[PDB]
Amino acid sequence: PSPREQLMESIRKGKELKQI
Amino acid sequence: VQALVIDNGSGMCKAGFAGDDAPRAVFPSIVGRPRHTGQKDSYVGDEAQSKRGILTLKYPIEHGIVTNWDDMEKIWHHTFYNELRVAPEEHPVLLTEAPLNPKANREKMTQIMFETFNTPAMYVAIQAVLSLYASGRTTGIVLDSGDGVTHTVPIYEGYALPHAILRLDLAGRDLTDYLMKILTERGYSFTTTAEREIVRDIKEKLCYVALDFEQEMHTAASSSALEKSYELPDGQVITIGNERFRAPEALFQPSFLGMESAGIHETTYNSIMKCDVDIRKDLYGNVVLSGGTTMFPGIADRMQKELTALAPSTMKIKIIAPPERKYSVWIGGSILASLSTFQQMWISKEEYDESGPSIVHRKC
Numbered sequence: 001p002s003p004r005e006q007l008m009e010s011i012r013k014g015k016e017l018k019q020i
Numbered sequence: 021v022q023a024l025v026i027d028n029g030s031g032m033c034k035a036g037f038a039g040d041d042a043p044r045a046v047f048p049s050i051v052g053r054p055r056h057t058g059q060k061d062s063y064v065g066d067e068a069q070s071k072r073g074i075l076t077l078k079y080p081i082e083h084g085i086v087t088n089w090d091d092m093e094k095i096w097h098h099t100f101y102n103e104l105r106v107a108p109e110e111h112p113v114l115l116t117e118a119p120l121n122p123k124a125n126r127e128k129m130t131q132i133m134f135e136t137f138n139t140p141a142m143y144v145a146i147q148a149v150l151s152l153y154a155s156g157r158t159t160g161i162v163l164d165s166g167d168g169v170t171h172t173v174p175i176y177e178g179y180a181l182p183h184a185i186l187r188l189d190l191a192g193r194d195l196t197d198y199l200m201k202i203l204t205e206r207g208y209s210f211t212t213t214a215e216r217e218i219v220r221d222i223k224e225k226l227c228y229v230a231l232d233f234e235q236e237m238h239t240a241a242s243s244s245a246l247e248k249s250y251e252l253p254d255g256q257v258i259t260i261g262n263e264r265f266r267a268p269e270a271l272f273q274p275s276f277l278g279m280e281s282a283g284i285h286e287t288t289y290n291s292i293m294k295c296d297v298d299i300r301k302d303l304y305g306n307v308v309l310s311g312g313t314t315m316f317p318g319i320a321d322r323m324q325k326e327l328t329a330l331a332p333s334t335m336k337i338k339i340i341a342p343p344e345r346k347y348s349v350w351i352g353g354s355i356l357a358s359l360s361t362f363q364q365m366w367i368s369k370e371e372y373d374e375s376g377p378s379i380v381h382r383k384c
């Protein structure tokens with residue numbers, strides 16, 4: 001679909017970030 | 021291939037690597053210029069402050085908007101070369117900007133990155149929008165209170181609605197200042213910049229927001245339950261009472277600072293009211309607190325109570341105050357720049373060389 005819609009969807013999914 | 025994330029705040033610059041949970045560097049947004057001109061050409065952050073007595077100290081982002089680009093280039097140069105120990109020509113750079121940033125300023129950020137720092141790619145994101153992304157939302161309203169500025173930002177699917185953005189020139193700096201003024205009643209004399217730093221620490225450790233100010237004032241007048249001790253660097257111990265909730269009360273009652281502004285609660289409501297009725301349910305149900313000044317214990321409940329008094333009776337209000345909200349702008353940037361789906365969003369040098377700085381408008 002739209003590149004912006006895929007971005008929005010991945011932001012809603014969330015992600016783990018590397019602990020520093 | 022690490023992207024860099026730079027959050028240029030009115031008070032503190034936060035910098036690090038995309039994919040990381042926290043910035044590698046946090047330093048004051050100050051540039052120091054020698055008064056005598058006779059040894060380094062400029063100093064940035066902690067070093068500028070440690071030599072304050074021989075430098076002309078500059079605050080180029082005092083209220084969230086850059087007022088001096090040379091000072092800004094110096095902050096960026098210090099971020100890359102001294103703080104992160106990176107060559108900016110080797111990394112995509114994600115920069116943050118204040119909401120309602122003038123179109124000319126977005127162009128200067130873009131030009132400086134490609135022309136002065138030779139970045140292979142860059143992107144400019146609104147701070148408040150990054151805070152919403154940090155909480156896993158794409159629609160919502162952000163109350164971002166930092167050091168020199170507070171903004172209320174309604175967001176619909178990643179787009180900050182500019183007609184609905186409101187700004188208050190009231191934040192942490194004003195609260196610290198107010199606290200020094202009110203602490204004189206206890207015979208305390210905080211005047212020097214080093215003493216201003218002690219008071220900022222008292223604010224950050226012992227201040228809170230009262231659920232009902234009038235009631236809280238009665239409690240402190242009737243008992244000693246709210247009195248707290250604080251040990252100064254010298255070793256001397258001081259007591260703080262109603263000043264604990266009187267200083268943050270200025271966010272809700274700007275008249276305490278001698279300001280005619282509406283409080284943070286009414287500003288949030290005014291922003292919601294500037295938006296289409298169809299998305300208001302989504303705004304009230306997603307109120308995201310961001311920035312150091314929203315860190316106060318009790319602030320979320322106070323916002324819930326205040327907003328409930330202004331909102332339609334049938335409206336479900338939800339306040340989201342993550343415990344890491346002091347760095348949520350940075351965290352959102354780290355998430356954004358390390359996402360696979362974001363990789364095609366970057367403004368490349370090739371695109372910039374073809375279009376000039378104006379490309380930021382079409383891309384960011």
Ligand SMILES: Nc1ncnc2c1ncn2[C@@H]1O[C@H](COP(=O)(O)OP(=O)(O)O)[C@@H](O)[C@H]1O
Nearest residue numbers: 029030031032166167192193224311312313315
């Ligand atoms: N725990 C805390 N409680 C209250 N205020 C805080 C706390 N931590 C930081 N602050 C205040 O927040 C401000 C810095 O917040 P920040 O969002 O980083 O600002 P900016 O982006 O404008 O530089 C300062 O005025 C600081 O004293």
Ligand SMILES: [Ca+2]
Nearest residue numbers: 029030147166
């Ligand atoms: Ca900020």
Ligand SMILES: [Ca+2]
Nearest residue numbers: 273274275281
């Ligand atoms: Ca007022």
